[PDB]
Amino acid sequence: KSIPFPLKDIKSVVEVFRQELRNDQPNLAQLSIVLGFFESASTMTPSLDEETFDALHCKFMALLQRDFTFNAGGLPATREIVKNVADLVWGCLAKSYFKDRPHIQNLYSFLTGNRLDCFGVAFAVVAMCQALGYNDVHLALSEDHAWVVFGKDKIETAEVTWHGKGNEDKRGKPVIYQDDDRCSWLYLNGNAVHCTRHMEVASIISSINPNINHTTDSIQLSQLQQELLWLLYDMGHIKTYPMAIANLGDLEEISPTPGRPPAEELFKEAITVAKREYSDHHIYPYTYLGGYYYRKKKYYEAIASWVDAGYVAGKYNYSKDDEEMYKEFHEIANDLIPNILKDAVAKANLTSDPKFFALVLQFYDGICLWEEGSPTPVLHADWAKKLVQSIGKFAPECRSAFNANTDTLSLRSAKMREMKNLITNTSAMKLQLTA
């Protein structure tokens, strides 16, 4: 019992994390309860007393003591045990809440209101396995999904949570790389983040949500998250975790910490990590950096980064499962690129520059590759409209220069290669883009 209750300031919370992170087995349940308490109170002085903390711990342990026994011999977990723990979690959830509500990612929400989001479920399963002494059970994270790995002599995998509307129940099933027609972004072609216990602590810090409303975040909770991410960073626990590094980049962009690297270098670090450890199969590190450049009005840099993102997306085969990445690219294509071009046309630059025009086409090239052979299309009539409007904002001599240079042969998708040849009208281009 080392926690000085009541916990009623950021410094005290960081100190609980500091102490637990020193250990081989940071207490996942305890840490999620504490963070969740503060997130709920801050996004509605928050003070967590000993009575409340003990009641939540009691309740968590009582849920497990019902049908599980501790792994006294240190055996590896089995598929049956993992599925059974997922079944417990799922069985405790309330039936009538919206699964994509914010602030329901942690064990506080689970224990006080029987609500968890899909990431929360997967974390819960791992935290319960830890409590039971199955320390082979770990979280695996893609960019928009989570599952578990377990076993000692043979590493095995199991689905434990839902994705999207959860119409398909996969509890206990292997994550296997097959479905050979289709390589899904959700599973990163095998380049998921496999967490140590310290990285599982990082996942709950990284998933802190300071949003109160669309225009207001909790400064206190943002400060807590930024401080905790620096702690993880400094002690080496997010060296292989791109989204945790990128989320820190986002925090530093908004509130730079004296003596720390610039946000831009943190974004580049997350990219370097992705390239080095994850076969350059992650998309978000490129869209985080692209977004940064966009907000800094560094438009050459922004589009180059979005092109990197598109060509990563092009490593995959699109499905409706990919809706979060769809939304990101939809905004880039339909809002942000047009914004850049409107600003540039607003001054008379990049609208006469074949190198810039090339990069715009390469962005759509990567999206086109992503969609190749998919039953469901990505580029609908609205994306087509916007692409043809965008192309129209470039100089005629700029476009024809693009056709006469090396960058012409660089396009890889059948759709964009067929498109460039409609250059020397709008209706034929629009039709081609949605074929």
Q: What is the dihedral of CA 55, 60, 65, 71, to 10 degrees?
A: -130
Nearest residue to 242 (alpha-carbon basis) of 283, 276, 200, 285 = 285
> 198-212: b or e for each residue (b if 16 or more CB lie within 10 Å)?
bbbbbbbbbbbbbeb
Q: Is 8 helix (H, G, I), strand (E, B) or coil?
A: coil
> DSSP letter string over 53-107?
HHHHHHHHHHHHHTT----TT-PPP-HHHHHHHHHHHHHHS-SSS-TT-SS-SSH
Residue pointed to by tokens 């609208």: 351
What tokens appear for 85 in the block? 């723990």
Q: Is 31 helix (H, G, I), strand (E, B) or coil?
A: helix
By what technique were these coordinates determined? X-ray
H helices of 132-236, in order, are 197-206, 219-234
H helices of 169-218, in order, are 197-206
**Cα 424 from chain centre:** 41
Nearest residue to 313 (alpha-carbon basis) of 378, 373, 369, 383 = 369
270 contacts 288 by C-beta, under 8 angstroms: yes
The total number of structural domains in the chain stands at 1
**Cα 316 from chain centre:** 16
What is d(CA 17, CA 202) in angstroms, rounded to the nearest whole number?
10
249 CB neighbour count, 10 Å cutoff? 25
What is d(CA 342, CA 387) in angstroms, rounded to the nearest whole number?
13
Q: Is 412 helix (H, G, I), strand (E, B) or coil?
A: coil
Query: Helix axis angle, 118-131 relative to 50-65, nearest 10°?
Result: 80
Burial tier of 3 (Cβ tally within 10 Å: 0-12, 13-18, 19+): middle
Q: What is the dihedral of CA 385, 339, 275, 254, to 10 degrees?
A: -150
Beta bridge partners of 213: 216
**Diameter of the chain by CA atoms?**
75
What is d(CA 33, CA 109) in angstroms, rounded to the nearest whole number?
8
What tokens appear for 409 in the block? 């042969």
343 contacts 350 by C-beta, under 8 angstroms: no
Instruction: List Cα–Cα distances, 389 to 3, 130, 347, 383, in angstroms.
Output: 60, 55, 18, 10
83 contacts 158 by C-beta, under 8 angstroms: yes
- In eight-state DSSP terms, residue 43 is T
H helices of 93-192, in order, are 107-113, 118-131
Residues whose CB falls within 8 Å of the CB of residue 4, separated by 6 or more in sequence, listed in order: 12
31 contacts 204 by C-beta, under 8 angstroms: yes
For 277-346, what is the HEC assignment? HCCCCCCHHHHHHHHHHHHCCCHHHHHHHHHHHHHHHCCCCCCHHHHHHHHHHHHHHHHHHHHHHHHHHC
Residues whose CB falls within 8 Å of the CB of residue 79, separated by 6 or more in sequence, listed in order: 156, 158, 172
What tokens appear for 380 in the block? 């609908």
Nearest residue to 404 (alpha-carbon basis) of 388, 420, 390 = 420
H or E element that contains 146:
strand 146-150
Q: Is 110 helix (H, G, I), strand (E, B) or coil?
A: helix
The domain in which residue 368 lies consists of: 1-435
What tokens appear for 327 in the block? 């939304």
Instruction: List Cα–Cα distances, 28 to 11, 39, 60, 372, in angstroms.
Output: 19, 16, 12, 42
Resolution (A): 2.0
Residue pointed to by tokens 């799922």: 90
Q: Is 216 helix (H, G, I), strand (E, B) or coil?
A: strand
278 contacts 191 by C-beta, under 8 angstroms: yes
Sign of CA dihedral 363, 365, 368, 369: negative
- In eight-state DSSP terms, residue 120 is H
What is d(CA 187, CA 33) in angstroms, rounded to the nearest whole number?
28
Burial tier of 29 (Cβ tally within 10 Å: 0-12, 13-18, 19+): buried
244 contacts 228 by C-beta, under 8 angstroms: no
Instruction: List Cα–Cα distances, 206 to 14, 112, 186, in angstroms.
Output: 14, 22, 19
What tokens appear for 141 in the block? 């994270």
Residues whose CB falls within 8 Å of the CB of residue 345, separated by 6 or more in sequence, listed in order: 351, 393
What tokens appear for 102 in the block? 């914010």
What tokens appear for 40 in the block? 């709920």
149 contacts 131 by C-beta, under 8 angstroms: no
> 83-117: b or e for each residue (b if 16 or more CB lie within 10 Å)?
bebbebbbeebeeeeebeeebbbbbbbbbbeebbb
